[PDB]
Amino acid sequence: QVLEGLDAVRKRPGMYIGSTDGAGLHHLVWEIVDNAVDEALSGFGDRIDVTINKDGSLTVQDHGRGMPTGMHAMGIPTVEVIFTILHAVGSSVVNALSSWLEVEITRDGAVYKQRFENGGKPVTTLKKIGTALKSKTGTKVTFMPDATIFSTTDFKYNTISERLNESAFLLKNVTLSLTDKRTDEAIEFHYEN
Ligand SMILES: C=CCNC(=O)Nc1nc2cc(-c3cccnc3)c(OCCN3CCOCC3)nc2s1
Numbered sequence: 001q002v003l004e005g006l007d008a009v010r011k012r013p014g015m016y017i018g019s020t021d022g023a024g025l026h027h028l029v030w031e032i033v034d035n036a037v038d039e040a041l042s043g044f045g046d047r048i049d050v051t052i053n054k055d056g057s058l059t060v061q062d063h064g065r066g067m068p069t070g071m072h073a074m075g076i077p078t079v080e081v082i083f084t085i086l087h088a089v090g091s092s093v094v095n096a097l098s099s100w101l102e103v104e105i106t107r108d109g110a111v112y113k114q115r116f117e118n119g120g121k122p123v124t125t126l127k128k129i130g131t132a133l134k135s136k137t138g139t140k141v142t143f144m145p146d147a148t149i150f151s152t153t154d155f156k157y158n159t160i161s162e163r164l165n166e167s168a169f170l171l172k173n174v175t176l177s178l179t180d181k182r183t184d185e186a187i188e189f190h191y192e193n
Pocket of ligand 1: 032033035036037039060061062064065066067068139140141
């Protein structure tokens, strides 16, 4: 297994996301959403909220266990490792192809955040920013796709709606939501089984 840095993704984005048009753009969404869905499939979290922000960024929020908040080697957070080493893999690929990315993790009474910029260079460490009830857990990821890479950076509400509907149907007993802050449009999907 040859590990790579995020430069590799940025130099050959098609190898990771298929293309740099709208299909590629929306693959970034699918990677992040899929990580939230896997966590719910494992039984952690009953809602996954997706927001298309006014600034063009996109947020996915789950209520799963929260990415681990500890360290890997050399004082590097586990989360930073997940987001910055390519095991070529979703999180690091989206980070690489984003002009900025923020991950917020809530667990154990604490809220932590790390911010990356300019294709996934950390501009902070994983820092405690606040507190929450001990019962509160989850992961939140927000990213701004890199307009220097994609031919289009406009997320399409209908495209995302359809994919989240399908994901809700396959998962069962989990609410998937989409809110578009550009247009105020909103929808929820939930299939009981
Ligand atoms: C919100 C947008 C995308 N949503 C997400 O990405 N949600 C995620 N939720 C988790 C939860 C865990 C997790 C797992 C176990 C215990 N506590 C938390 C996790 O661990 C990383 C894999 N590790 C686990 C430790 O052993 C090596 C493998 N990753 C994610 S990623």
